[PDB]
Design an enzyme around this catalytic site. Structure first.
Site: not given
Ligand SMILES: [Cu+2]
Ligand SMILES: [Cu+2]
Ligand SMILES: [Cu+2]
Ligand SMILES: [Cu+2]
Ligand SMILES: [Cu+2]
Ligand SMILES: [Cu+2]
Lengths: 340, 340, 340
Positions: A87, A90, A92, A127-128, A138, A143, A248, A272-273, A299
C-alpha cells in the site's frame, strides 16, 4: 532541518472530525498523523453482504485530517504484517512524487514517514495508489479519505465576510463493485486477492453494485443519524475518490458551496444540488432553519434509495410556519370539484 | 394568519410557461397553484413504445411554476381516485419537511394544501418522493418538474446589468428505464404496479433505455419545434431530477448560463456546453444571431441521437454572412491537389 | 468581399500545437486551415486491438487550431475518394448553420470551404455531425478535435493579471465502443460500415470499452511522455466531444482552470480535479514545482488504469524537499509499537 513545533493529532472515525481550530493565530507547525492500513471483511448493505475491504484506520472513508495553510503534514503510514499486499498514499493536497505515492510504497510489516507542505487550501482526497490496475482496485476497495487545509483566518464567503461552522461532518461516498454468481446473488471471498479477478470484471463495466456513505448502506440513518440544531451552521465535507456524485440536502440547501472544494475560490450560494467530480472533495455550509428529519443523498435517486447512498440528519428545534406550513391536511377531494 | 393578496396562476403545459412578469413592483403575494397527479400510459418514442407514466398535470415534465423572491407559494396537490398509489411533492426551492414531502403524502381520492415561502432565487426541481424505493421510481416514471423564483428586479448578469428575455422555454429531460423481453423488445404493462419489478431491475443498472425532452423522443422536433427570431433573447430552463445532462445549442452558445441554476450567483458567459447535475435545474440565456434550424441536445450524442434527447429551434430572420459563410460550395477535389 | 490579410496555418499532430502567438498586436486576419478526413483502421490499446476509425487529419483527436478573437477562420474540409462515407464539420466556436455542419456536408471526392468569425474566446470542440444516428457514430469513431480562440491580449486570471504559458499540450480524450464476440474478445472489421451495427449496440449501453488520450491506451506514456521543466507554466487543453471526464494531474494541481473552457470567465484556482462536460473543451494552467514523473488521468481510476486514460509528464529539475520529503524510508514496524 525543519525547526517548527510539532503537534500530534489523534484522528477519529468518520463522520466525525478530530478537534481543531478554524481561525488560528498559531504559526506553522509540523502536524503529525498516523494512518494504519487495515485489510478486512466488512458488511456493506442492509442484507448483510460482505466485502473484502482495504482501509486507512479501519474505516471507509479514512478519517478526515485537518490542518492550516502553511503547516507541514508529517504522516506515518503503517502497513501491518497481518495485511497481504503493498500500500501507499497519494495526497491530492500535496505537491510532487505522485502526491506522495512514489515515496510511500510499503510492504506488510513496514512503515514509512512522509512530510508534505500544506500550500493549497480546500478539502482534498487522499487515496492509496500502488501502481497500474492496483490503483483503482485499492481505491474502490475503500482506501481513500480526505484532508482539509483551512486558511489561517478560517473560511470566508469570497466577498470579505468570515464564515464559521458550529459543526462539521465528513461524508465519504464509496462506489463498490461486488461480483454476483449465476443466480444473481453477491459472492463472498476469503481474501482480497481471491476477490480480485471477479471484482475487476465488475469494475470494467463502470456500474457500481453499491454506492454508500461511511462504508455501508444505512450507516448514517437510524441510530447513527447526524445531529444538528436549528440555527447551527453545519459544514458537510463530501468526497468521492473515483466517481462523480451530486449531493443534495432534502428540505435544505447549500448556503455556501465550494463544489470543486478549494477555498481560494468564492463559494456558490443557495444551491439545491451540487456536484463532486470523481477524484475530489467538496464542501457545503448550511444553517438549519427547520427541525425534523433531513435526508442527505446523491441525487441520482436510484443510487440514493436502492444502492445505499442516503444519510439522515435529525435536527432539533422549533418549526417555522412562515417558511413552510401545511395549510390543509389530507382530505377527500370535494364532491363539487371539477379538475379537468 | 398570513394577510397578503392572493393570485391564482393557471399553469400551462411545457415547454411553454404561464404568463408572468420578470421585474415587478408588486409586493409579496400568496401565489396559488394546483397540481393534479395523473398516472397514465404514454408513448415515449418514435416506434410507439408505451410506458406506465406518473405525472403532475398529465405532462412530463410537470409544468413550470414562476414566482418572485418573497412570494408564498400555496400548492394544492390532488391525487384523484382513478390513481392507484400514494403521491407527494418535494420542492427543492422550499425549506423544511423534506421539501414539503413530509406534509403532502396523499392517497388516491385525497388532496392537500402546502405553503412554502420563496426565499431562494433560481430555477429548482420539484418531484414526487413517497419514501424509500418509491422515491426514484416515481421520479423516473415522470413525476418531476421545476419552479422558477425570480428576483423582484428580474435577472442580472452579476456585474450590475439587467438581463431580460423575450421568450422562455422549459425543457424537462427524463431518463426512462423500460424493460425488454428475451427477444430484446420493450415490454408493455397494464398498470404501473405491474411494471415495477421489471423496471426496478433496469433502474439498478443505472443505464436509461430512453432520454427524452418533454416526455417523448421527437417531442420538440418537426411540427413541435421551438420558435424564435433573430435578435430575441431566449431563456432555456433545463431540468433533470435524477441524472446528469450536458445541454448544448448546436450552432449557438449559452450567452449567460447559471449551470447550477441559482440567480444569487453570477452566470458564466459564452459557454458551448453546460452541465445540469442530476437533481437540479439550470438556465441559459441566448440571443439568436442567425436564422435556421438549431438542434438542442444533451451532448452525449448517443443519448441525443439514439435515445431521444434532441429538440429543435426554428429561427426566423436574415442570414449574417460576416458571422459565417460558405465560401465555396461542395466541389470535386482538384485534379492538381496533393493532400499528403 | 472580406478584405483582410490571409495567413495559412500548418497544423501539427496532437498533443503538440502549431506555432502561434499568445498576446498579439496583429489585427484580424483570415486564418486558413485545411482538414482532410481519413477513415482508417487504427490500433487503440496495448493488446493490439484494432478499430475502424474516422479522423480529421489522420489523428485522434484532430489537431488543435489556434486563432485570436476577431479572426475569421477559413477551413477547407476535404473528403478524399478513398473514404466511404459523407462527412462534415461543426465548430462549437462558430455561430449558425449547426456550427457549420449544415454548410459542409461532402461526399467522398469532394471538398468545401467554410468561413466562421471567431467571436467567442476559449477552447471549443469541433466534430463531424452528418445527421441523425451518424452524428454520435462519427464522433465516437474519432471525428473530433478542438479550436482555441485566444484574447488578443492573451490569457488573464480574471482579476487583472496576465497569464502566460511556456508550453501547451492538447489532450483529446476519446470514448470508444468496440464490439466483443461470444468469447468476450474484441471483434475486427474490414470497414467502418461493416462495424456499424455491432458498434451501435455497444454505444446504446453508454459504457465505453476504451477511454483513451491521443487515440490509444499508452499513447502518451513511455517514450511519448509529455516533457516539461520545473518552473514552466504549462497549459493543458482537454477535450471530450461525447462524454464527461474529470482530469487530474497526479502530484500536481490546476493553478488556474477554466473548467467550462471559456476565457471570458475567470479561472478557478488551485483545483485538484476538474470536470470536462461531454461536448466541450476545458483548460488548466499549472506551473511545475517538482521534477519527476506525473500521471495525468481522468479520475475515474478504472477508466484511467484499466480502459486506457493515463498520460505521463516527465519533468526535469531539482527536487524541493520543503514541499515534500521522505522523512523515513520504508522500515520494519518497531517491535515496541502498539497501533491498536
Ligand atoms: Cu492500498
Ligand atoms: Cu488521485
Ligand atoms: Cu408519485
Ligand atoms: Cu430531490
Ligand atoms: Cu464524419
Ligand atoms: Cu457538438
Amino acid at each position: 532541518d525543519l525547526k517548527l513545533p510539532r503537534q500530534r493529532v489523534d484522528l477519529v472515525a468518520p463522520p466525525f472530525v478530530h478537534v481543531h481550530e478554524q481561525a488560528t493565530k498559531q504559526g506553522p507547525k509540523i502536524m503529525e498523523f498516523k494512518l494504519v492500513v487495515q485489510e478486512k471483511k466488512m458488511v456493506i448493505d442492509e442484507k448483510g453482504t460482505t466485502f473484502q475491504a482495504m482501509t486507512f484506520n479501519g474505516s471507509m472513508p479514512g478519517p478526515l485530517m485537518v490542518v492550516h495553510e502553511g503547516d507541514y503534514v508529517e504522516v506515518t503510514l503503517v502497513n501491518p504484517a497481518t495485511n497481504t499486499m503493498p500500500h501507499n498514499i497519494d495526497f491530492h493536497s500535496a505537491t510532487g512524487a505522485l502526491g506522495g505515492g512514489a515515496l510511500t510504497l510499503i510492504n506488510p510489516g513496514e512503515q514509512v514517514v512522509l512530510r508534505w507542505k500544506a500550500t493549497r487550501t480546500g478539502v482534498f482526497v487522499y487515496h492509496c495508489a500502488p501502481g497500474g490496475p492496483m490503483i483503482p482496485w485499492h481505491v474502490v476497495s475503500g482506501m481513500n479519505g480526505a484532508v482539509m487545509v483551512l486558511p489561517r483566518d478560517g473560511l470566508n464567503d469570497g466577498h470579505g465576510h468570515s464564515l464559521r461552522y458550529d459543526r462539521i461532518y465528513y461524508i465519504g461516498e464509496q462506489d463498490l463493485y461486488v461480483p454476483r454468481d449465476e443466480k444473481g446473488n453477491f459472492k463472498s471471498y476469503d481474501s482480497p486477492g481471491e476477490a480480485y479477478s471477479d471484482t475487476e470484471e465488475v469494475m470494467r463495466k463502470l456500474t457500481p453494485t453499491h454506492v454508500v456513505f461511511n462504508g455501508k448502506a444505512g450507516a448514517l440513518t437510524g441510530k447513527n443519524a447526524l445531529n444538528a440544531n436549528v440555527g447551527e451552521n453545519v459544514l458537510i465535507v463530501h468526497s468521492q475518490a473515483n466517481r462523480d456524485s451530486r449531493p443534495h440536502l432534502i428540505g435544505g440547501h447549500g448556503d455556501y458551496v465550494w463544489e470543486t472544494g478549494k477555498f481560494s475560490n468564492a463559494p456558490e450560494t443557495g444551491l439545491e444540488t451540487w456536484f463532486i467530480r470523481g477524484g475530489s472533495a467538496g464542501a457545503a455550509l448550511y444553517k438549519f432553519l427547520q427541525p425534523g428529519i433531513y435526508a442527505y443523498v446523491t441525487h441520482n435517486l436510484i443510487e440514493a434509495a436502492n444502492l445505499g447512498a442516503t444519510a439522515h440528519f435529525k435536527v432539533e428545534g422549533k418549526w417555522n410556519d412562515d417558511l413552510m406550513t401545511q395549510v390543509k391536511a389530507p382530505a377527500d377531494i370535494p364532491t363539487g370539484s371539477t379538475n379537468e
